[PDB]
C-alpha cells in the first residue's frame, strides 16, 4: 500500500518549538489537516516537494511553517513558538496518483500544548449509595482526577466486568489538568458480595492504582 | 476561501434506511468535491470524490451526487459500520476547504435518564476539594440539561460535563456532570442537587443530599 507515516506524540510547553514529520512509503504534494480536541476538519496548507512550491490556508500563513525533504519522501509541519491553541491532531494527506486527490492520509500526530506538568491522577470513590440506586440497580464508579497528559485507561475486576460500564471522556480543567469518570450499573443485592475494583493506568507519570469501591 | 455547508450537522437513522446528507459550496466548485467517513479515535477515510467516483473498496450502498454549489451523499441501506461522521471537502481552489461534518447517530425511541448522585469522598475532602458528580445513565436523545444548586443557589463556573458515545447495544448516551468547590466552600453549605431536564421526563428531576447526612 502507498503509506504516510507521520512521527509520535508531543507533549510541549507554551513558546517550545516543535517539528513533525509525515514520510511517504510504497505523492507529488502532501497537504496538512488540523483537527482540534472535539472540533472538525480544517485544511492548513500543501507543499509540492519536486521544487518545495507552498502555498497556505490564509488562517495559517506566518503560524506554522510547512517544509519538504524529497530525497527522503518526508514533508514536515513546524512551530517556532507553540501556543496552547495548537493543542489538535495533525494529518498529512496526499495523492497515490494523477487522478484521485487526497486518497492517501497519515495516521495523525497528537500534539498538546500546556504550561502544566506530568502528573498522576488521584483516584476517588464514587461510592454505592440509597442516593444512587435505582429500583434494584445501583451505580457506582472512580473518579480519576488532576492528571496530565492524555492519556488515562480504565478497566473493572482487571477487565472481569464490562457490562453496564461507562469510561467518560475527560474534561480538561482551568488547572491545565484533566479529569474523567468510570461509572458501572450493578444489581444492588451484589453490593457486599461482589468486590468492585477500578484499575487506573497513567503511563505518562508510571502510576497504576487499584481502587476498591464500597458502599 | 470557499465557505462549505454540511446539513444536517446530525442525523438519526435505523440500520436498512437510506439516508442523504448535503454539502453546500459558496461558489461554483463543478464537481471537485470529496466525502470522508470519520470514527472516533481514527483518521479520515475518502470515500468519494470528483463529487460521484467512488474509492476503491468502498461499498457501493455510498454514492455522491451534485454539481456546482449543492452536493449529496447517499446511503441507500444503512449498515451499522455506517454510523460515523461524514465530511466533504472542495478540491478546487487552494485552501481546500472543509464543510463542519454531519453525525449519522443511531435512531431509537425517547428514553428516560436514571439520574445518581455522588457526595465527595472523604479521600478527597483530606485533599483539600469537593467534587460532587451526577450520573445521567442510558438515555435519549443525547440533548439534556444539568443544573446544579447549592442550598437551592444556581451554580455557574464551576462544574464541566461530558458524554459517552451512543452505545451501540442499546443505542443510549450517559452524560457525567462534576461540580468541584474547594473543602472550604463545600462546608459552608448543606444542600446539593443536581437538576435534570430530559425529553424523557415530564417534569425535572432532582437528586441531592445533605453534607453530612
Ligand atoms: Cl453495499
Ligand atoms: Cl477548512
Ligand atoms: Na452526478
Known amino acids: 500500500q502507498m503509506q504516510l507515516v507521520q512521527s509520535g506524540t508531543e507533549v510541549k510547553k507554551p513558546g517550545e518549538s516543535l517539528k513533525i514529520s509525515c514520510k511517504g512509503s510504497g505523492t507529488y504534494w502532501i497537504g496538512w489537516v488540523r483537527q482540534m480536541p472535539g472540533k472538525g476538519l480544517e485544511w492548513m496548507g500543501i507543499?509540492?516537494?519536486?521544487?518545495?512550491?507552498?502555498r497556505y490556508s490564509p488562517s495559517f500563513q506566518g503560524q506554522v511553517t510547512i517544509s519538504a525533504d524529497k530525497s527522503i519522501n518526508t514533508a514536515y509541519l513546524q512551530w517556532s513558538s507553540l501556543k496552547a491553541s495548537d493543542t489538535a491532531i495533525y494529518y498529512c494527506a496526499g495523492g497515490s496518483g494523477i487522478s484521485t486527490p487526497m486518497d492517501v492520509w497519515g495516521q495523525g500526530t497528537t500534539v498538546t500544548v500546556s504550561s502544566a506538568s506530568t502528573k498522576g491522577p488521584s483516584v476517588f470513590p464514587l461510592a454505592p449509595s440509597s442516593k444512587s440506586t435505582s429500583g434494584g440497580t445501583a451505580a457506582l464508579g472512580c473518579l480519576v482526577k488532576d492528571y496530565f497528559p492524555e492519556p488515562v485507561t480504565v478497566s473493572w475486576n482487571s477487565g472481569a466486568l464490562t457490562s453496564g460500564v461507562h469510561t467518560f471522556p475527560a474534561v480538561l480543567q482551568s488547572s491545565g489538568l484533566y479529569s474523567l469518570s468510570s461509572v458501572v450499573t450493578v444489581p444492588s443485592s451484589s453490593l457486599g458480595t461482589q468486590t468492585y475494583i477500578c484499575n487506573v493506568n497513567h503511563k505518562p507519570s508510571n502510576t497504576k492504582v487499584d481502587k476498591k469501591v464500597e458502599p | 476561501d470557499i465557505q462549505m455547508t454540511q446539513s444536517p450537522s446530525s442525523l438519526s437513522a435505523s440500520v436498512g434506511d437510506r439516508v442523504t446528507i448535503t454539502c453546500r459550496a459558496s461558489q461554483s466548485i463543478y464537481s471537485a468535491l470529496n466525502w470522508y467517513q470519520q470514527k472516533p479515535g481514527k483518521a479520515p477515510k475518502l470515500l468519494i470524490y470528483?463529487?460521484?467516483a467512488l474509492q476503491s473498496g468502498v461499498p457501493s450502498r455510498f454514492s455522491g451526487s451534485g454539481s456546482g454549489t449543492d452536493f449529496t451523499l447517499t446511503i441507500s441501506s444503512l449498515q451499522p459500520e455506517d454510523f460515523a461522521t461524514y465530511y466533504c471537502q472542495q478540491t478546487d481552489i487552494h485552501p481546500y476547504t472543509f464543510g463542519q461534518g454531519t453525525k449519522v447517530e443511531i435512531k431509537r425511541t425517547v428514553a428516560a435518564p436514571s439520574v445518581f448522585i455522588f457526595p465527595p469522598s472523604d479521600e478527597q475532602l483530606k485533599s483539600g476539594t469537593a467534587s460532587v458528580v451526577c450520573l445521567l445513565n442510558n438515555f435519549y436523545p443525547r440533548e439534556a440539561k444539568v443544573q446544579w444548586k447549592v442550598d437551592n443557589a444556581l451554580q455557574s463556573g464551576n462544574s464541566q460535563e461530558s458524554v459517552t458515545e451512543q452505545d451501540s447495544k442499546d443505542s443510549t448516551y450517559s452524560l457525567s456532570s462534576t461540580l468541584t468547590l474547594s473543602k472550604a466552600d463545600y462546608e459552608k453549605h448543606k444542600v446539593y442537587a443536581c437538576e435534570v431536564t430530559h425529553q424523557g421526563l415530564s417534569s425535572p428531576v432532582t437528586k441531592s443530599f445533605n453534607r453530612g447526612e
Open positions: 507543499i509540492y516537494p519536486g521544487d518545495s512550491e507552498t
Open positions: 470528483a463529487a460521484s
